[PDB]
Design a protein around this ligand. Structure first.
Ligand SMILES: [Zn+2]
Ligand SMILES: [Zn+2]
Length: 79
């Protein structure tokens, strides 16, 4: 019937990789939410070559799952 009401929200909480709905993603270091599957990797066939760290397919920024819980008190100024 009417348009414009109950429809004013702009949020980017959708896995840009698989292009699906997010139920409980994991905010990366750079600031991106992805699925638990798209991130975690089971099938590892990296033999001839080394390396094995979930990268950021959204933009591409080497991050880690430790820096988040590395510092709690001593925080650096950003602004
Ligand atoms: Zn996904
Ligand atoms: Zn990112």
């Amino acid at each position: 019937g009417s348009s414009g009401s109950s429809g004013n929200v702009q949020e980017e909480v959708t896995c840009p990789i698989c292009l699906e709905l997010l139920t409980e993603p994991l905010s990366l270091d750079c600031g991106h939410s992805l699925c638990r599957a798209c991130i975690t990797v089971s099938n590892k066939e990296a033999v001839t070559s080394m390396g094995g760290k979930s990268s950021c397919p959204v933009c591409g920024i080497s991050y880690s799952f430790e820096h988040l819980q590395a510092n709690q008190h001593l925080a650096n100024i950003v602004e």
